[PDB]
Enzyme design. Structure first.
Site, PDB file in Angstrom:
ATOM      1  CB  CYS A   1     -30.468 -13.819  63.017  1.00  0.00           C
ATOM      2  SG  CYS A   1     -30.651 -12.778  64.373  1.00  0.00           S
TER       3      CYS A   1
ATOM      4  CE1 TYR B   1     -22.477 -10.601  58.815  1.00  0.00           C
ATOM      5  CE2 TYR B   1     -22.292  -8.259  58.823  1.00  0.00           C
ATOM      6  CZ  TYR B   1     -22.583  -9.388  59.411  1.00  0.00           C
ATOM      7  OH  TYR B   1     -22.954  -9.176  60.651  1.00  0.00           O
TER       8      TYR B   1
ATOM      9  CG  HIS C   1     -21.937  -7.731  63.680  1.00  0.00           C
ATOM     10  ND1 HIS C   1     -22.804  -7.658  62.616  1.00  0.00           N
ATOM     11  CD2 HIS C   1     -22.550  -7.098  64.706  1.00  0.00           C
ATOM     12  CE1 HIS C   1     -23.909  -7.034  62.991  1.00  0.00           C
ATOM     13  NE2 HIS C   1     -23.788  -6.697  64.261  1.00  0.00           N
TER      14      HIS C   1
ATOM     15  CG  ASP D   1     -25.444  -3.408  65.430  1.00  0.00           C
ATOM     16  OD1 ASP D   1     -25.776  -2.371  64.821  1.00  0.00           O
ATOM     17  OD2 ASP D   1     -25.915  -4.488  64.950  1.00  0.00           O
TER      18      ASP D   1
HETATM   19  C1  LIG Z   1     -30.305 -10.989  64.731  1.00  0.00           C
HETATM   20  C2  LIG Z   1     -31.117 -10.369  65.714  1.00  0.00           C
HETATM   21  C3  LIG Z   1     -32.554 -10.793  65.955  1.00  0.00           C
HETATM   22  C4  LIG Z   1     -30.955  -9.012  65.845  1.00  0.00           C
HETATM   23  C5  LIG Z   1     -32.183  -8.285  66.230  1.00  0.00           C
HETATM   24  C6  LIG Z   1     -30.102  -8.283  65.027  1.00  0.00           C
HETATM   25  C7  LIG Z   1     -29.324  -8.891  64.062  1.00  0.00           C
HETATM   26  C8  LIG Z   1     -29.410 -10.268  63.920  1.00  0.00           C
HETATM   27  N1  LIG Z   1     -28.631 -10.861  62.965  1.00  0.00           N
HETATM   28  C9  LIG Z   1     -27.784 -10.098  62.143  1.00  0.00           C
HETATM   29  C10 LIG Z   1     -26.981 -10.670  61.106  1.00  0.00           C
HETATM   30  O1  LIG Z   1     -27.392 -11.633  60.421  1.00  0.00           O
HETATM   31  N2  LIG Z   1     -26.147  -9.868  60.334  1.00  0.00           N
HETATM   32  C11 LIG Z   1     -26.091  -8.506  60.480  1.00  0.00           C
HETATM   33  O2  LIG Z   1     -25.315  -7.859  59.762  1.00  0.00           O
HETATM   34  N3  LIG Z   1     -26.901  -7.938  61.464  1.00  0.00           N
HETATM   35  C12 LIG Z   1     -27.734  -8.708  62.296  1.00  0.00           C
HETATM   36  N4  LIG Z   1     -28.523  -8.096  63.263  1.00  0.00           N
HETATM   37  C13 LIG Z   1     -28.305  -6.645  63.663  1.00  0.00           C
HETATM   38  C14 LIG Z   1     -29.141  -5.579  62.920  1.00  0.00           C
HETATM   39  O3  LIG Z   1     -28.919  -5.698  61.522  1.00  0.00           O
HETATM   40  C15 LIG Z   1     -28.840  -4.136  63.519  1.00  0.00           C
HETATM   41  O4  LIG Z   1     -27.533  -3.674  63.234  1.00  0.00           O
HETATM   42  C16 LIG Z   1     -28.972  -3.873  65.049  1.00  0.00           C
HETATM   43  O5  LIG Z   1     -30.139  -4.479  65.540  1.00  0.00           O
HETATM   44  C17 LIG Z   1     -29.044  -2.399  65.475  1.00  0.00           C
HETATM   45  O6  LIG Z   1     -30.072  -1.612  64.845  1.00  0.00           O
HETATM   46  P1  LIG Z   1     -31.670  -1.392  65.250  1.00  0.00           P
HETATM   47  O7  LIG Z   1     -32.459  -2.701  65.247  1.00  0.00           O
HETATM   48  O8  LIG Z   1     -31.748  -0.591  66.485  1.00  0.00           O
HETATM   49  O9  LIG Z   1     -32.487  -0.634  64.231  1.00  0.00           O
END
Ligand SMILES: *c1c(C)c(C)cc2c1nc1c(=O)[nH]c(=O)nc-1n2C[C@H](O)[C@H](O)[C@H](O)COP(=O)(O)O
Ligand SMILES: *c1c(C)c(C)cc2c1nc1c(=O)[nH]c(=O)nc-1n2C[C@H](O)[C@H](O)[C@H](O)COP(=O)(O)O
Ligand SMILES: Nc1ncnc2c1ncn2[C@@H]1O[C@H](COP(=O)(O)OP(=O)(O)O)[C@@H](O)[C@H]1O
Ligand SMILES: Nc1ncnc2c1ncn2[C@@H]1O[C@H](COP(=O)(O)OP(=O)(O)O)[C@@H](O)[C@H]1O
Ligand code: SF4
Ligand code: SF4
Lengths: 729, 729
Positions: A30, A169, A172, A267
């Site tokens: 996000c 997806y 989570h 995560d």
């Molecule tokens: C939102 C926010 C800003 C963060 C940083 C992570 C995130 C966000 N929204 C996600 C969502 O829409 N769906 C999804 O599957 N994953 C989402 N993420 C998590 C991101 O994809 C990573 O899994 C984690 O941040 C861990 O990895 P890393 O950033 O250390 O490389």
């Protein structure tokens, strides 16, 4: 030069019908964009395109109003208005020649649905362990078909929309995972019980999705192979592998994580409890059964660590989230071997803080253009260079003023950066010394590295540390055309707080048993067996100090007049912070403020001690029954954590004689950082980013407007619909 | 017809250059629309325009990006895009011959400003007692001029936008009040200290705003005459009257509230601690001193109480908000003396619960269309009549089927409403029977009253209460055309919660020391001296029960595995519900869940007991150090508040036999309210609002698309602006 061991990183890869130019992949995450901020969505991923990441993805994307994440914002792909707005981004990721994924989401009872009001469906009736007020309907078999069609529908519209990649997806702990996982799934029909029951939903869904756009789009899934909860949820070596096994023919790509939704901190690892690669032990296990491309995040910013996990056949590609927000250009920097230019994500999770609060846009503590690329049109690696000879004094070289100079000098100005400290970083320097925060250094580290680099490129420009604090005379006589004061803020000395906005009588930390978090942090001043942290601060200061002192073996009680660590709930830090303060037997007294300090003794009170019924009691007179629960607790040493205030002493002075800047050839002086107001680090760093980018406007001291992405009356989100009020009569 | 005592109420009033048709006017209040949802804004105010209210206001409206309330939504009047967007509503208030007001807002540091990132200004440097991390910088005297400008610039654009009334918003502790109020103002200059200084700020402001649109626009103030804090903040008989005195020449009309920001509940009184007119004592003192029209909210719904407060010269006008959401038409219902048709707002504050979570639309527990007037074009007083002879069976007369009945019958359908309860209302019947919640009955009271009158008009329709619960076969053979099951949900009996989604070992409320929230409320089961309530729910059930038992003089411990009364935070219930639990010596054990019940005793544990260090530990073992905190506590009687589930038994039965519906002349069966899934009352009521309105679509069971208010790509918010990315270089 590119170290050639990293070549490995620029080797294409096959993902079904699709080809990744290279190994650098931005997973779904996000940003505060969704389908609703199509400017901001396009720009911020397209720079990472141009930056040379291979594939870019929208954040989790809703397939239907009965998964609406409001108040959070997700993306949506419900209608042809959405397919409009998301295409803006695909075209835009396209023109730079990587790929556009979109992450197909339905999250069942984890979607509170506060906008759409509709009812969410799941495998079994439950109530979310996260939105605890929000319950699902149990799907019967017809509910299974209609929701699955949902994704289909949404997968079609994803292709119209121009996505090269589509996901099912399943991380989570959203729909497909809820079926899989027995925590949620209490079904005894054919969708439940047996491992192939559990995964039928997803297995089905995957297939349906393939069938749908399979020949034009690679179908990937993300999956949460271990819940890190243990027995009773998914375990990688139990259900995880096996599932990988049952899916593998459907998937074009695995995209791996561990955790649930309630503490996805696992995560998105805080650098405060996790290092890089943290996930790997559970990442690994997926290759050992998959015959397909596998990626799996883990705050991978180091190309060394990157090559390890590929040449050890633990991933095939590199999955990033945060690190791509820090540095949209991190690949072309690695390709270009420009190792020193890389802006390292600190794991501060402020970026997840905004989204997690419900509504605001992401911001970021290294990357101050993050969120700023459409609406302010700041590019992270291109700067308007000045068309004069103008020069800038900057007082103080903390987050704020150091960005100040970074940006200016990158803008071509002539800058003299001075601070009384010996090194670049203002208060980050202690901050990073707090237990866990050692990877928050990185934020001065990068600055120190680039200013140094910037100085060889501007010849007039100057760094001066170890200086005599500047005075306003030094300043008026300095000869900068312009001046940025960036002098900081200090902890409050005097028990001044957010509740009373006045000093606590008998608070003062020149006394021997009374500390600030500077004095605790400098390590000089001596600290009594019994400690009480008096806390008015919702962010990290308090807990952290608590940790420090406990681990140094004092006896610790936090007196909190606010909800402790509230911010932290939002950076994903809170679970492991609490568990941690438990483990170190740290005492917490909530809902408890303080009314006078005495040597060895303070008077504390419950904040709900006043009377419940409010009467007109006439003037001079509390209109509740008065608060009768005050009581006296002792301490060896008291640590105030009550609030912070801006050090604007010099700027007071420079302002007072603002009449003499004109003779001195000073065309302006601007205030920034904590010295205007106490702010986040992130926000500190922006205010520097701004005055710099904006040194040339009429009054730089105040921001110039930015794009706003908000709807224009008479314009239909829906193509060719009626904007007009329309009642059904 | 209209009791003539009440004509008083339709007598026009002068306000500066502007004429109020009558004395029914909707003060400023939020709806979740602000500048961002202009369909929504327009409509929701227009129908109150159509319904006879005389002047309608926008919610708190931002003068400038450095007062942004994101993640909260307020309105905006920042540039032309805003003037357009607010225009729609002024045009639309206008067509019904009412006024359009807009409340001009600056917040200082109560504006977290997470969208704009800018720095907010105040009289003194503080940290908000609300948004505790958000600080302001202290105005120098140019600062004092710049900010007032803003107000002026905003008040012109107000005028271009078509407003009749312009406020200088000084209530709930925002900027103006922040000068006047020493809790905030520590200035020693000509802005600070005396009363004359402290009002300076507002005083000039009001002036310049009058000078600015004074000729075309009524200048209103809204002013907080007592903060209901005691001395140290504003008292009515201290500075209150005295302020009104100073200001009186500029202000075309007083708008009086009591309370601050962090607990404005006191203004918007919960009917669980405020009765109607609760504000008066402090409201009336204003008249004493003012020569101008005065209004002052206090949830007035009752025309009697209405005409009490004018004849007693306590007010000149009637200000509502909540009642206006409740019944947009209230006045044309007084006016038409149709007293039995007025829908009385119950003061549940659910409306203010959405705004306060930050982002979602408002919704309301009595009025189902509020919010729903644009994007679903449901009108509160006008129904699409049926074009057939169909008939509906509704099983269960609770919020949800009762609303279903009320709307269907209003749409000309023939309905038969069956419920084995004696009285219309399902569960709200008990729930109104909780301490304080006596005013929530109104929500059945109103539907019993309209179904009784609808019967009379729809002669084959029928209501039947005190019946044998319906069986599957009754229903089949019942002959309705379609059937609505609205059978409810019940508290869960076996310790099923949102933290394990499994039942606790040894919970069962067939045992004589374990009670559910129904058993309690029934008053039958005998309850022993010491009580523990084991809570999973974040809304009012637990605390309420606590309140009752305690006041029944048992000895009371709340164990809660979630944050207690979290919701209530957002209804503005929380503080007084706490001080109440306090005064009643009610024991709170938070962050405590339970793993085993025995007779007289339960095994509870700290949810932060697990260890902090997550290692991969192979399958079948916890990856943290295990939780060693378990410990036994005693009780005489245990009160389970742990979740709820859907009564869906009949429905699982009718659908097992869906096969035989067509044989039986049944075109469909739709499930609503708690039975489909456990929901607020609001929501449960909306569900029934919905299947009615939509009884004639594809699948009632699922809502039709509503219009959404999101931007379409390639359309700029700004008139004649650039939508395209443009970086600054
Ligand atoms: C939102 C926010 C800003 C963060 C940083 C992570 C995130 C966000 N929204 C996600 C969502 O829409 N769906 C999804 O599957 N994953 C989402 N993420 C998590 C991101 O994809 C990573 O899994 C984690 O941040 C861990 O990895 P890393 O950033 O250390 O490389
Ligand atoms: C929002 C919500 C929906 C409630 C009803 C009250 C409210 C809201 N937003 C406000 C804001 O825009 N500014 C402001 O000054 N006051 C706001 N309020 C308060 C409302 O104006 C009334 O002051 C109180 O609600 C009590 O009125 P009543 O509803 O009892 O008549
Ligand atoms: N008189 C001044 N001259 C030079 N440096 C100053 C002066 N006053 C304060 N400082 C320095 O200013 C920096 C302020 O840093 P910091 O708290 O990190 O504020 P910010 O976070 O906004 O950069 C500190 O390193 C401190 O040494
Ligand atoms: N089998 C049934 N036959 C008739 N009435 C029923 C039957 N089962 C439940 N009810 C009624 O259903 C209503 C459910 O309403 P309630 O719990 O208040 O639901 P909601 O909150 O959705 O209104 C209860 O009043 C009960 O009367
Ligand atoms: S806010 Fe922090 S953790 Fe997030 S991307 Fe930025 S530097 Fe990384
Ligand atoms: S939610 Fe409740 S307090 Fe609000 S307008 Fe509706 S009935 Fe009134």
């Amino acid at each position: 030069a590119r170290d050639p061991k990293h070549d490995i990183l620029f080797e294409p890869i096959q993902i079904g019908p699709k080809t990744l130019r290279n190994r650098f992949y931005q997973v779904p995450h996000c940003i505060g964009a969704g389908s609703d901020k199509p400017g901001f969505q396009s720009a911020h991923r397209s720079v990472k395109a141009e930056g040379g990441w291979a594939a870019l993805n929208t954040e989790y994307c809703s397939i239907n109003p009965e998964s609406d994440d409001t108040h959070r914002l997700s993306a949506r792909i419900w209608d042809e208005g959405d397919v409009r707005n998301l295409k803006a981004m695909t075209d835009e990721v396209h023109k730079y020649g990587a790929l556009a994924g979109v992450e197909l989401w339905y999250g069942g009872a984890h979607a509170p649905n506060m906008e759409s009001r509709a009812t969410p469906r799941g495998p079994s009736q439950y109530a979310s362990e996260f939105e605890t007020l929000s319950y699902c309907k149990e799907m019967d078999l017809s509910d299974i078909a209609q929701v699955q069609q949902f994704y289909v529908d949404a997968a079609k519209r994803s292709r119209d929309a121009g996505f090269d990649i589509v996901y099912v997806y399943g991380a989570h702990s959203y729909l497909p995972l809820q079926f899989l996982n027995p925590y949620y799934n209490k079904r005894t029909d054919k969708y439940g019980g047996s491992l192939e029951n559990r995964a039928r939903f997803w297995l089905e869904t995957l297939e349906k999705v393939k069938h749908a756009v399979g020949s034009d789009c690679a179908i990937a899934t993300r999956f949460g192979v271990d819940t890190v909860y243990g027995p009773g949820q998914i375990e990688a070596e139990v259900d995880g592998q096996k599932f990988v096994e049952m899916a593998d023919s459907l998937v074009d790509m695995w995209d791996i994580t561990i955790g649930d939704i309630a503490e996805w901190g696992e995560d998105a690892g805080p650098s405060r409890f996790y290092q890089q690669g943290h996930t790997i032990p559970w990442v690994k296990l997926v290759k050992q059964v998959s015959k397909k491309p596998v990626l799996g995040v883990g705050r991978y910013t180091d190309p060394e660590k990157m090559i390890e996990i590929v040449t050890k056949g633990y991933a095939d590609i590199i999955g990033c989230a945060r690190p791509s927000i820090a540095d949209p250009f991190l690949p072309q920097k690695v390709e270009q071997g420009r190792y020193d230019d890389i802006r390292v994500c600190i794991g501060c999770n402020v970026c997840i803080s905004r989204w997690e609060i419900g509504g605001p846009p992401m911001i970021c503590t290294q990357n101050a253009t993050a969120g700023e690329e459409y609406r302010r049109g700041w590019h992270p690696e291109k700067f308007r260079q000045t068309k004069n000879k103008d020069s800038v004094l900057i007082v103080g070289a903390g987050p704020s003023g150091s960005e100040a100079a970074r940006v200016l000098m990158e803008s071509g100005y002539t800058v003299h950066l001075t601070d009384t400290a010996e090194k670049i970083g203002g208060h980050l320097n202690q901050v990073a010394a707090l237990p866990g925060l050692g990877e928050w250094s990185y934020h001065r580290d990068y600055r120190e590295t680039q200013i140094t680099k910037l100085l060889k490129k501007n010849k007039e420009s100057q760094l001066a540390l170890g200086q005599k604090p500047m005075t306003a005379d030094d300043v008026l006589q300095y000869g900068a055309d312009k001046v940025i004061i960036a002098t900081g803020a200090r902890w409050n000395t005097d028990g001044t707080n957010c509740l009373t906005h006045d000093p606590i009588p008998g608070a003062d930390a020149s006394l021997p048993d009374q500390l600030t978090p500077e004095q605790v942090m400098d390590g000089k001043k001596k600290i009594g067996k019994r400690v009480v942290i008096l806390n008015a601060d919702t962010y990290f200061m308090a807990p952290s100090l608590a940790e420090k002192l406990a681990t140094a073996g004092h006896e610790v009680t936090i007196v909190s007049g606010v909800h402790l660590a509230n911010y932290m709930h939002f950076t994903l830090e809170y679970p492991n912070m609490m568990r941690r303060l438990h483990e170190l037997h740290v005492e917490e007294l909530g809902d408890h403020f303080c009314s006078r300090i005495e040597p060895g003794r303070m008077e504390i009170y419950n904040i709900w001690g006043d009377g419940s019924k409010r009467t007109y009691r006439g003037p001079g007179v509390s209109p509740r029954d008065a608060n009768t629960s005050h009581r006296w607790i002792e301490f060896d040493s008291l640590v105030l954590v009550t609030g912070r205030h801006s050090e604007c002493t010099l700027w007071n002075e420079l302002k007072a004689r603002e009449s003499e800047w004109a003779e001195n050839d000073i065309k302006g002086i601007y205030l920034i950082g904590d010295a205007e107001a106490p702010r986040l680090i992130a926000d500190a760093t922006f205010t520097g980013h701004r005055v710099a980018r904006e040194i040339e406007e009429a009054n730089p001291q105040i921001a110039i407007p930015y794009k706003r992405e908000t709807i224009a009356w008479g314009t239909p989100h829906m193509p060719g619909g009626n904007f007009k009020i329309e009642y059904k009569v």
